[PDB]
C-alpha cells in the first residue's frame, strides 16, 4: 500500500495487478489523465510524435544496413532472375546442422531470408547500385533520425517556445503544408529522380565526385526557361533497351512514350517525374489559398459559414464547423485516419497493375505480400478513423454549439442512417449466399449446368470503353471505330493504358461470374463493417437502453444486467465488434487476389473461372490445393525448404484459437478460481510470508475483449502472412 | 557479504562471462 505510477492516481494505488496492465495502456491517453492541460496535451502529443519520425529512421537505417556487406546486391544488380534475394542473416543457436540446407541460400554464406519488402527494387530502382558505391543508408537516415529527437527536446524546453495556442490555426499551416511540404516535397523528389537516378537507370552512372560535370545532355538546361519544353519527349528511351545500359538508351528526359516490356514491366523511367513535377505546381498553386497575415486569400470560415450549396433556402444550418473540428483534435485524428485509409489501398491496389519497379510482378511474390500489408493496415485504419469520430461525439462535441447545424441533423436524423445501411447488408447478405450455396448444391449434385452465374457486365463494360479491345464489339457510338476519340488519339493513350487482355500482366484481368460474387462480397463487408462503425459512432452519446451513455463515452464496457440485459454497448465495443469484419472484408478482398495471380502465373486461369463461381472449391483448390509445399516441409523426412513458415502457420493457428478464452470466458469464472488458487501459497509451506506486491486478479471486463483480439488478430494475420509466402514461393503458380 | 551497494556489478560481470565467451568459439562445432 504505497504510491506509484506517475500520471494517474486512481490507478496509482490500486493493490491488484490491474495496477500494471492498465498502466501500460493509459500512457497514450493524454487528453484528461492527471497530468494534463490543453497546453500540456497538445505539446504532449507534439514532442510525442517527434518521438515519431524518430523511430521511423532507426527502422529504415537498419533496412539499408542488413544489406551492404552481405545480402546480395553486387549480385541482384547483375540481373535479378527470380531466385531468392536477401534481408539479413538468421542466427539461432537452436538451428540444427541443416543450417546447410537451403536456409543458406546460394550466393551468401551463413543462412538468410531475402527481401519480400520492395526496398530491393527501389534502393535499386532509383539507381543506387555499386557495392563499393553503396554502404550509405544508416549513415544519413540516422544522422537524420537523431535530429528527429532533437526538436523533440528543444521544442519541449519551455523558453525557445514549445508553442501553445499556435496549435489551432490552420490557414497558416496547411496554407503552409500543401505547398511548403507536399509541393516542394514533390518538386525536390522531381529533382532527384531526374538529375541522379534516371541517368542511373537507362543511361550510366554519376560518380560521387561530379554533380556539376555530369549534365544529362551536352548543352545544359538549354532553353527550358525558354518556354519551349516540348522537345524533351522525342526519342526518349526505346525498347531494344537492355535496362540500365543505354544502347537503345537515348537521352531526353520525360515522355509518355513506348510502354510495357517483357524486360521489366513497371512505369516508364521518366513519367513518374514529369508527374512528380506536374503535380508540384498545383499544390504550390494550392498552397497560398488561405490567410497568413499579409492580407490576401481566405478565412477558413466565411466560406463555410453561410457558404453552403444545397442549403440556402432548405432550413439546414452550417455554424462553426471550424471551432469544432479545431476545438476537437479527434475530428482531427480521423479525418486524418481515412483519406489515409481510403488512399492506403489506392496506394496498394494501384501498386499492382502499375508497379513502378525494376523487376516486380514477374517477381510475383514480393508483389503479393505487399498489396496486403497495405490492405491490412488500410482496413486496420478506417476502423480507427471511424473510432476517433465516435470519441469526438463524447469527450469533445457540444450540442448547443453545433445545432440546426449540419453535423447535428446527422445525429438527429440517425435512426434511418443505420437501417438504410442495414438494409444494404441484409440484401447484400442472403443474395450473395443464395448464389454460392446454389452454385455449390448444383455441383456435388452432378449438374455443373444449372449453376447460377451472372456475367459481371457493368465491370467488363468499364474497359470496353478503355482498351479492353477484347474480341471486338461495337457499342452504339464507339463501334471499335467510325467515331473513335476524334478529339483524342496519338497523344496521351499511346501504348499505355493499352495492355488489353495480356495473359501475363495486362493490368486488367478479364472478369467473369467468379468476380461478380467476391466483388459483391467485398461490398457486403464495408457496409456491414460500417453499419456497425456508423452505428458504433452514431451514438457513443446514448440511446433508449442506455440514454445517458456519457462523460466517458468510449470504453465503459459492460453494464449491469436488467434493463433488457446490457452489454458490449460502448462505442468501443462496437469498434471492438467492428474489427472482426475489417478482418473479414480485408480477407475476402486479399484472398481473392491470389487465386487469380497464382493461377494467372505459372499456369492457367480457367481455374478461377468455373472454380470460384462456387464455394467448396474455394476451400478445395486454393486453401487445400496450394499449401502442399509448406506443410510436408517439417515432413517426417527431415526439414526441407521452408520451416520458419509452417511453424509460423501453426503458431498462426494457436495465437488465433487461444484468442477465444478471452472471448468466451468473461472475467467472472477466472477471478473466482484465483480466489481458491490464492488460498494455496498463503496455506502452503516453503512458499509462505513470500508476499506479492500486486493482488492476484482476473482481467478487466473490457481488457479481455481486447486481448482476445490483439490475439485473434496476429494469429489470423500471422497465418496468411506465412500462408501466402509459404506458397507463393514454391509455386507452381 | 559486503552486499553494501552491489548486484549491479555481478549483472554486468557474471552475465558478461556467461555470454561473452559463452557465445563466440574459435572453430564452431556449429549450430
Amino acid at each position: 500500500a504505497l504510491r506509484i505510477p506517475r500520471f494517474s492516481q486512481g490507478i496509482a494505488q490500486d493493490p491488484t495487478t490491474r495496477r500494471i496492465w492498465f498502466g501500460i495502456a493509459t500512457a497514450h491517453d493524454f487528453e484528461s489523465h492527471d497530468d494534463i492541460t490543453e497546453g500540456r496535451l497538445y505539446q504532449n502529443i507534439f514532442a510525442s510524435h517527434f518521438g515519431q519520425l524518430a523511430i521511423i529512421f532507426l527502422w529504415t537505417s537498419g533496412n539499408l544496413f542488413h544489406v551492404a556487406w552481405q545480402g546480395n546486391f553486387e549480385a541482384w544488380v547483375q540481373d535479378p532472375f527470380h531466385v531468392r534475394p536477401i534481408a539479413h542473416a538468421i542466427w539461432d543457436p537452436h538451428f540444427g546442422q541443416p543450417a546447410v540446407e537451403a536456409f543458406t541460400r546460394g550466393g551468401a554464406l551463413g543462412p538468410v531470408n531475402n527481401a519480400y519488402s520492395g526496398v530491393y527494387q527501389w534502393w535499386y530502382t532509383i539507381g543506387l547500385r555499386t557495392n563499393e558505391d553503396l554502404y550509405t543508408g544508416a549513415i544519413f537516415l540516422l544522422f537524420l533520425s537523431f535530429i528527429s529527437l532533437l526538436a523533440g527536446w528543444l521544442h519541449l524546453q519551455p523558453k525557445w517556445k514549445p508553442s501553445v495556442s499556435w496549435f489551432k490555426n490552420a490557414e497558416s499551416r496547411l496554407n503552409h503544408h500543401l505547398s511548403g511540404l507536399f509541393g516542394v516535397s514533390s518538386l525536390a523528389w522531381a529533382g532527384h529522380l531526374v538529375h541522379v537516378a534516371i541517368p542511373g537507370s537507362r543511361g550510366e552512372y554519376v560518380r560521387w565526385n561530379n554533380f556539376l560535370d555530369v549534365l544529362p545532355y551536352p548543352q545544359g538546361l538549354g532553353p527550358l526557361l525558354t518556354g519551349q519544353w516540348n522537345l524533351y519527349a522525342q526519342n526518349p528511351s526505346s525498347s531494344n533497351h537492355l535496362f540500365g545500359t543505354t544502347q537503345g538508351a537515348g537521352t531526353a528526359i520525360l515522355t509518355i512514350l513506348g510502354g510495357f516490356h517483357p524486360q521489366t514491366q513497371s512505369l516508364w523511367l521518366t513519367d513518374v517525374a514529369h508527374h512528380h513535377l506536374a503535380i508540384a505546381f498545383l499544390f504550390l498553386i494550392g498552397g497560398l489559398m488561405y490567410r497568413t497575415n499579409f492580407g490576401i486569400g481566405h478565412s477558413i470560415k466565411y466560406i463555410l459559414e453561410a457558404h453552403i450549396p444545397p442549403g440556402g433556402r432548405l432550413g439546414r444550418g452550417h455554424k462553426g464547423l471550424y471551432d469544432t473540428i479545431n476545438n476537437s483534435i479527434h475530428f482531427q485524428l480521423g479525418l486524418a485516419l481515412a483519406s489515409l485509409g481510403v488512399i492506403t489501398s489506392l496506394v496498394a491496389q494501384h501498386m499492382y497493375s502499375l508497379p513502378a519497379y525494376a523487376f516486380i510482378a514477374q517477381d510475383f511474390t514480393t508483389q503479393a505480400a505487399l498489396y496486403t500489408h497495405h490492405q491490412y493496415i488500410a482496413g486496420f485504419i478506417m476502423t480507427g478513423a471511424f473510432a476517433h469520430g465516435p470519441i469526438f461525439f463524447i469527450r469533445d462535441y457540444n450540442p448547443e454549439q453545433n445545432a440546426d447545424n449540419v453535423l447535428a441533423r446527422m445525429l438527429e436524423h440517425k435512426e434511418a442512417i443505420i437501417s438504410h445501411l442495414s438494409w444494404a447488408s441484409l440484401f447484400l447478405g442472403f443474395h450473395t449466399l443464395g448464389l454460392y450455396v446454389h452454385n455449390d448444391v448444383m455441383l456435388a449434385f452432378g449438374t455443373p449446368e444449372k449453376q447460377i452465374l451472372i456475367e459481371p457486365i457493368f465491370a467488363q463494360w468499364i474497359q470496353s470503353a478503355h482498351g479492353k479491345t477484347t474480341y471486338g464489339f461495337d457499342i452504339p457510338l464507339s463501334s471499335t471505330n467510325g467515331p473513335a476519340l476524334n478529339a483524342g488519339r496519338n497523344i496521351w493513350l499511346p501504348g499505355w493504358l493499352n495492355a488489353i487482355n495480356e495473359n501475363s500482366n495486362s493490368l486488367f484481368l478479364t472478369i467473369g461470374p467468379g468476380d461478380f460474387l467476391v466483388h459483391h462480397a467485398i461490398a457486403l463487408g464495408l457496409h456491414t463493417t460500417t453499419l456497425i462503425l456508423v452505428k458504433g459512432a452514431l451514438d457513443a452519446r446514448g440511446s433508449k437502453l442506455m440514454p445517458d451513455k456519457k462523460d466517458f463515452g468510449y470504453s465503459f464496457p459492460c453494464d449491469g444486467p436488467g434493463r433488457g440485459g446490457t452489454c458490449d454497448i460502448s462505442a468501443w465495443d462496437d469498434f471492438y465488434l467492428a474489427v472482426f469484419w475489417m478482418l473479414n472484408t480485408i480477407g475476402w478482398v486479399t484472398f481473392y487476389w491470389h487465386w487469380k495471380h497464382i493461377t494467372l502465373w505459372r499456369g492457367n486461369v480457367s481455374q478461377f473461372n468455373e472454380s470460384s463461381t462456387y464455394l467448396m472449391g474455394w476451400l478445395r483448390d486454393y486453401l487445400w490445393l496450394n499449401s502442399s509445399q509448406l506443410i510436408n516441409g517439417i515432413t517426417p523426412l527431415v526439414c526441407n525448404s521452408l520451416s520458419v513458415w509452417a511453424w509460423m502457420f501453426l503458431f498462426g493457428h494457436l495465437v488465433w484459437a487461444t484468442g477465444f478464452m478471452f472471448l468466451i470466458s468473461w472475467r467472472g469464472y477466472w477471478q473466482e478460481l484465483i480466489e481458491t488458487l490464492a488460498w494455496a501459497h498463503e496455506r502452503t509451506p516453503l512458499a509462505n510470508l513470500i508476499r506479492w506486491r500486486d493482488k492476484p486478479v482476473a482481467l478487466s471486463i473490457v481488457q479481455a475483449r481486447l486481448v482476445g483480439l490483439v490475439h485473434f488478430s496476429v494469429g489470423y494475420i500471422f497465418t496468411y502472412a506465412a500462408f501466402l509466402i509459404a506458397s507463393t514461393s514454391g509455386k507452381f503458380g | 557479504t559486503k552486499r553494501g551497494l552491489l548486484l549491479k556489478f555481478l549483472i554486468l560481470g557474471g552475465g558478461s562471462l556467461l555470454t561473452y565467451v559463452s557465445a563466440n568459439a574459435p572453430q564452431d562445432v556449429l549450430p
Binding site: 539461432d92 | 559463452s22 557465445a23
Partner: peptide, 30 residues
C-alpha cells in the same frame, strides 16, 4: 582469429532483457 561475430543476440535478445525485467521491476519498486 577466424569466425566470431556472436554477441549482438545475447546482449540484446538475452542480456538487454535481463536489464529491464530486472531494472523495470521499478514498476513494482526501485
Amino acid at each position: 582469429m577466424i569466425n566470431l561475430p556472436s554477441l549482438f543476440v545475447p546482449l540484446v535478445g538475452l542480456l538487454f532483457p535481463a536489464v529491464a525485467m530486472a531494472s523495470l521491476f521499478l514498476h513494482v519498486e526501485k
